[PDB]
Amino acid sequence: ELRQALMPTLEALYRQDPESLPFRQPVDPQLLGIPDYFDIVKNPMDLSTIKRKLDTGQYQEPWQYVDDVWLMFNNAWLYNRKTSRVYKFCSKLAEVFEQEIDPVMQS
Ligand SMILES: CC(=O)N1CCc2[nH]nc(Nc3ccccc3)c2C1
Numbered sequence: 001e002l003r004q005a006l007m008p009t010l011e012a013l014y015r016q017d018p019e020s021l022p023f024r025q026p027v028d029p030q031l032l033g034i035p036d037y038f039d040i041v042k043n044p045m046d047l048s049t050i051k052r053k054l055d056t057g058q059y060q061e062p063w064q065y066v067d068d069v070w071l072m073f074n075n076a077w078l079y080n081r082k083t084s085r086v087y088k089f090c091s092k093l094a095e096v097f098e099q100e101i102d103p104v105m106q107s
Contacts, residue, residue: 001057002059002060002061002062003054003055003057003059005062005104005107006054006059006062006065006104007054008100008104009069009097009100009101009104010047010050010051010054012096012097012099012100013047013069013093013096013097014047016092016093016096018089019089019090019092019093020047020089020093021089022076022086022089022090023046023047023072023076023089023090023093024046024047024048025046025047025048026044026046026048026049027041027044027046037079040078040079041075041078041079043071043075044075045068045071045072045075046072047072049068050065050068050069050072053065053068062104062105066101066105069097069101073090073093073094073097076090077090077091
């Protein structure tokens with residue numbers, strides 16, 4: 001529905017390699033060895049969760065989807081250092097999103 005207008009913006013994020021790679025599944029702190037992650041990031045989000053919410057009709061307005069996208073970005077800028085790989089990958093996704101979402105959010 002509105003799913004149809006938003007889906008391409010989400011595909012644009014997925015298509016970034018390798019920059020989407022830290023963002024494809026939920027952060028798995030046990031596996032990565034980062035036990036402080038849930039102390040810092042109170043509300044985790046990732047592409048796989050946004051894609052499920054999108055497919056199951058959980059975004060009723062466009063701002064709800066944009067909110068989860070930026071929750072994913074803001075979480076990563078918070079947790080990771082400015083000098084870090086994952087922080088820089090997040091910056092690239094945010095550039096790509098700005099480009100894709102703007103004309104969609106006009107139409
Ligand atoms: C998104 C985020 O804030 N993560 C916590 C730190 C971190 N370190 N490494 C990752 N995940 C990752 C990095 C490169 C490739 C695949 C997964 C992550 C995920």
